Amino acid sequence: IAESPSGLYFIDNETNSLYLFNGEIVSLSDKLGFRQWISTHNVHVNWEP
Amino acid sequence: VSSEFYAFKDGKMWEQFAGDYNMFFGEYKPFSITFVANAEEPNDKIFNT
Amino acid sequence: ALKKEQHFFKGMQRDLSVSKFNPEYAFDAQNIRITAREHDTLLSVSNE
C-alpha cells in the first residue's frame, strides 16, 4: 500500500491485479496490461525484510 | 481457495490451471473455434484458402 | 485469387444472422481463452 495524492496503490494477490482506489477502484494492471506479470509473481507468504 | 481456483468432481478435488493443457479431470477434451466468413455477402464467393 | 478477408477474435457472439455476423467475433468456441493467462496471450486465441 502506497499513499499518494491520486489514491491508494495496493496489490491484491487473490484477484491477481494492481488496483488504485481514488473513490472508485481501478485495476491498473488490467488497464495497462500487467495481469500475467502479477499472476506469475504472487505468493501467500507476507512481506518481511 | 486462497489465491487458487479449485473444482470438485467424482468425489475428488481438482486444482485447475495447474496441469497439462486440454486435460480435464484426466480426460482429453478438444478445443475448436467457429467464425462466420461473410465479407461482401451480396456477392457469391468461392472460399479458396 | 481475387479477394481476401482478415478475421479477428475479440470474443464469441451468437444469436445474430449469418448474413450479418461480424468478423471480430467467433460464432462458437470450445475450450479457448482470449485473455492473457500464464502468458501474454490477450486478444489471441489460446488453449485452456
UniProtKB/Swiss-Prot annotation, chain B:
Organism: Bacteroides phage crAss001 (Bacteroides phage PhiCrAss001)
Domain of life: Viruses
Protein name: Muzzle protein
Signal peptide start and end residues: none
Localization, UniProt: Virion
Described function: Forms the muzzle assembly at the distal part of the tail. May serve as the gatekeeper to control the ejection of the cargo proteins.
Record's subunit section: Homohexamer.
